[PDB]
């Protein structure tokens, strides 16, 4: 029986590979060679945040591009005012080793997570004024790698246990469990339509997940090492992955295969974060070389280099409205670019 | 400037004062990571230090300085992801079962892996070879010989510069020093000198155990300061 199942799985993998190669009529490069070049993008640091004490490990842009949340290993979440640089709220965390943070779309709640395996959603609109732990839900058997809000009551979170789950804030229990990853989940990004979400794990592969149905629709194995970063294309039809291989790859859900691989010989350090711009042409990816790089989604050429940070840039994100870019590094100094 | 903007700047200055106040407490406390396999007696060591939670923060004070010892024992075996964040810490407390020769090879392999880790290439490792009493009893009984597991032990002579404690049988001393030399060689190979291993022998009833961590952390911080001030 086991041998029959193994042979069936091998035949299915071969058939999937053949079907994927058949549709490989042309690469994105050949079609994007006729378009004008993006040129050099000389970005300058407009704001410098000097509040965080420890290594900045996470950040996210809410519905409003003025407020910015960022997490540090010291157990502090500071809602930074990008415009005026002021500090809106300071949230002393019970778990110092926080590795993720997200700003809810409604702008009322903010989540976090880390080695404690407990996701603490802090309400920023409490009638008492002070920040309070709304729901300290738990249940994961591993460190929380990423968390993102879907609505005012639903939040998806990734854990080191190699499985993702959707949590119900009001009920405080898992709404659905997502399994299939062989390695610890590390990255998670939500689609613009909120229908599907993609997540990466220590395994050299990615999977597309559905929020309404507890099952994965597609699986991408076009990677050489652990995929640490991932981000949904603004249109929700494609996504770029980041791995320690120091090479970014653009995957399209409609094509179901790699379109363009952004790689270079002089880039040997791994990748930790990836983000797309409003137009999608500027593919911003953070590298362990103590600086971020901007790649062209179409031409694949390096658009620019952000050498402002002196330490490993671990997190970065672009504003929703597309007005500025935030980059958080282990140097405890968050520099905004525009 | 508007009144609301001025009050926002005032609250920002208040939050900055709070952060600066917390910064002193943060930098004044020494963070320590406790690693070791399930066989290692790290739990016993933690219990002795009385001077699905993925994190177990243990705080103890010795000589008017606070120590923050973190024990990660409620997570998967894979550690190449979360071990990175534990960088920049004072020292890493690694515990190995020196009595169990079978798991000794796995412990050595884990120690080698942790030592050669990229992001931890600048953090020292405090190596506590626990269960020395069990190792001594075993090597005295003669039922289990290290030669069966390590052939080099047969051709290993006790270090001449060694300082055997009073009442130590030659076999016990030789075995413990062989294990210590194996660990020191594993740490030396590929070691750029940026971080040093602090091997120590710990027992089940030894009360003078936290002093070892105190001395190791003080030496590590002194060396880091010397490197910062360009004195070395």
């Amino acid at each position: 029986e086991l041998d029959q199942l193994r042979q069936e799985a091998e035949q299915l993998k071969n058939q999937i590979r053949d079907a994927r190669k058949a549709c490989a009529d042309a690469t994105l490069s050949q079609i994007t060679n006729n378009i004008d070049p993006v040129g050099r993008i000389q970005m300058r640091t407009r704001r410098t945040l000097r509040g965080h004490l420890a290594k900045i490990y996470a950040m996210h842009w809410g519905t409003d591009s003025r407020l910015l949340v960022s997490a540090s290993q010291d157990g502090k979440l500071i809602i930074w005012d990008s415009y005026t640089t002021n500090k809106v709220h300071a949230i002393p965390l019970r778990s110092s080793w926080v590795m993720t943070c997200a700003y809810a779309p409604s702008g009322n709640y903010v989540a976090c997570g880390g080695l404690d395996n407990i996701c603490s959603i802090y309400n920023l609109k409490t009638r008492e004024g002070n920040v309070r732990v709304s729901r300290e839900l738990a249940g994961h058997t591993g460190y929380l790698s990423c968390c993102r809000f879907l609505d005012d009551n639903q939040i998806v979170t990734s854990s080191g246990d190699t499985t993702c789950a959707l949590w119900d804030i009001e009920t405080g229990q898992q709404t659905t469990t997502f399994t299939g990853h062989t390695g610890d989940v590390m990255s998670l990004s939500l689609a613009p339509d909120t229908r599907l979400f993609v997540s990466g794990a220590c395994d050299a592969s990615a999977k597309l997940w559905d929020v309404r149905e507890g099952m994965c629709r597609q699986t991408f194995t076009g990677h050489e090492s652990d995929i640490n970063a991932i981000c949904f294309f603004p249109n929700g039809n494609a996504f770029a992955t980041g791995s320690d291989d120091a090479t970014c790859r653009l995957f399209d859900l409609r094509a179901d295969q790699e379109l363009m691989t952004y790689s270079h010989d002089n880039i040997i350090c791994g990748i930790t974060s990836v983000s797309f711009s409003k137009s999608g042409r500027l593919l911003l990816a953070g590298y362990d070389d103590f600086n971020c790089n901007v790649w062209d989604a179409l031409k694949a050429d390096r658009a620019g280099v952000l050498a402002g940070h002196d330490n490993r840039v671990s997190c970065l994100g672009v504003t929703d409205d597309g007005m500025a870019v935030a980059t958080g590094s282990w140097d405890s100094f968050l520099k905004i670019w525009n | 400037l508007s009144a609301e903007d001025k009050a926002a700047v005032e609250r920002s200055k208040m939050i900055e004062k709070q952060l600066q106040k917390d910064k002193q407490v943060y930098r004044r406390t020494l963070r320590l990571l406790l690693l070791g396999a399930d066989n290692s007696g790290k739990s016993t060591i933690v219990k002795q230090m009385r001077i699905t939670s993925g994190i177990f923060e243990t705080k103890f004070q010795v000589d008017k300085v606070n120590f923050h010892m973190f024990d990660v024992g409620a997570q998967r075996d894979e550690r190449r992801k979360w071990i990175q964040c534990f960088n920049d810490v004072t020292a890493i407390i690694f515990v190995v079962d020196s009595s169990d020769y079978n798991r000794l090879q796995e412990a050595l392999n884990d120690f080698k892996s942790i030592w050669n880790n990229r992001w931890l290439r600048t953090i020292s490792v405090i190596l506590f070879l626990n269960k020395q009493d069990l190792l001594a009893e075993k090597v005295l009984a003669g039922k289990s010989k290290i030669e069966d597991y390590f052939p080099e032990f047969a051709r290993y002579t006790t270090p001449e510069d060694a300082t055997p404690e009073p009442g130590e049988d030659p076999r016990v001393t030789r075995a413990k020093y062989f294990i210590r030399k194996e660990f020191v060689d594993i740490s030396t190979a590929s070691g750029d000198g940026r971080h040093i291993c602090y091997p120590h022998f710990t027992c089940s009833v030894d009360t003078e155990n936290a002093r070892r961590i105190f001395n190791d952390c003080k030496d590590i911080i002194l060396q880091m300061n010397l490197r910062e001030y360009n004195l070395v």
């Epitope: 005012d81 008492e128 004024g129 | 508007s2 009144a3 609301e4 926002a8 200055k13």
Partner: single-chain antibody, 230 residues
Framework: VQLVESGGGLVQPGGSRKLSCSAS????????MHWVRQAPEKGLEWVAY????????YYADTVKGRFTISRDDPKNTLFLQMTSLRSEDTAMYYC??????????????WGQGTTLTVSADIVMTQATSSVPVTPGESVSISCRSS???????????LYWFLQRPGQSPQLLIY??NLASGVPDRFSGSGSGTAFTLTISRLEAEDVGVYYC?????????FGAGTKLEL
């Protein structure tokens, strides 16, 4: 959240009295406190202000020097020392909390108030002092300011307050933005100097005195008040 003021009573001219307000149900340390008086059968008027941590303290020209504000965060209490009380100072003082940050709602909670029976600033002028209207009808209130409240940051520092008969003022609009707990029937719009408050469908409990306030400069001036009679 609840603010309870105390210390009111009869005081002769030239005397001294200290009002006290006990804060509870919120982080008093993070909220800046305001003092607003209301003379009998008259509008509102700002008295003094103290910021978080006692860093910034202000007083109105009508009371500067005589009144001194102080707070004790460890006990969550506010104090307003009054000296040389004048016959004109007879009024009911309301303690108000305020927290300043992007998206905040200053002046969101007004205390129960305490009565004291003794013995340039931007001016705000409302369309009318009284407006009789029937229930269910759409009511529109308007006011004008002598200086443009639209600051360079695009924020219109206008506030609207509703003081129902026998109750303390309640915040309705703190900038078009609707305060928490206020029904959607209330809406605010206006230019840099012309402002309008609209009630899409007036309720029986919506009757009362509507007070405006400018916050472009700390010398706060409250409107003359517009009554809505059922």
């Amino acid at each position: 959240v609840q603010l309870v003021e105390s210390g009111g009573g009869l005081v002769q001219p030239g005397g001294s009295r200290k009002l006290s307000c006990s804060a509870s149900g919120f982080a008093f340390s993070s909220f800046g406190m305001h003092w607003v008086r209301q003379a009998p059968e008259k509008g509102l008027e700002w008295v003094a202000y103290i910021s978080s941590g006692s860093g910034t303290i202000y007083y109105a020209d009508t009371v500067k020097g005589r009144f001194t504000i102080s707070r004790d965060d460890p006990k969550n209490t506010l104090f307003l020392q009054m000296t040389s009380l004048r016959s004109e100072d007879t009024a009911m003082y309301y303690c108000v909390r305020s927290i300043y940050y992007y998206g905040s709602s200053p002046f969101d909670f007004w205390g129960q108030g305490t009565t004291l029976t003794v013995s340039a600033d931007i001016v705000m002028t409302q369309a009318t002092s009284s407006v009789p209207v029937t229930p269910g009808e759409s009511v529109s209130i308007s006011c004008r300011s002598s200086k443009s409240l639209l600051h360079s940051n695009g924020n219109t520092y206008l506030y609207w307050f509703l003081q129902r008969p026998g109750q303390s003022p309640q915040l309705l609009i703190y900038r078009s933005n609707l305060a928490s707990g206020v029904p959607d029937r209330f809406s605010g719009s206006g230019s840099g100097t012309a402002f309008t408050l609209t009630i899409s469908r007036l309720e029986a409990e919506d009757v009362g005195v509507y007070y405006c306030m400018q916050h472009l400069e700390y010398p706060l001036t409250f409107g003359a008040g517009t009554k809505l009679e059922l």
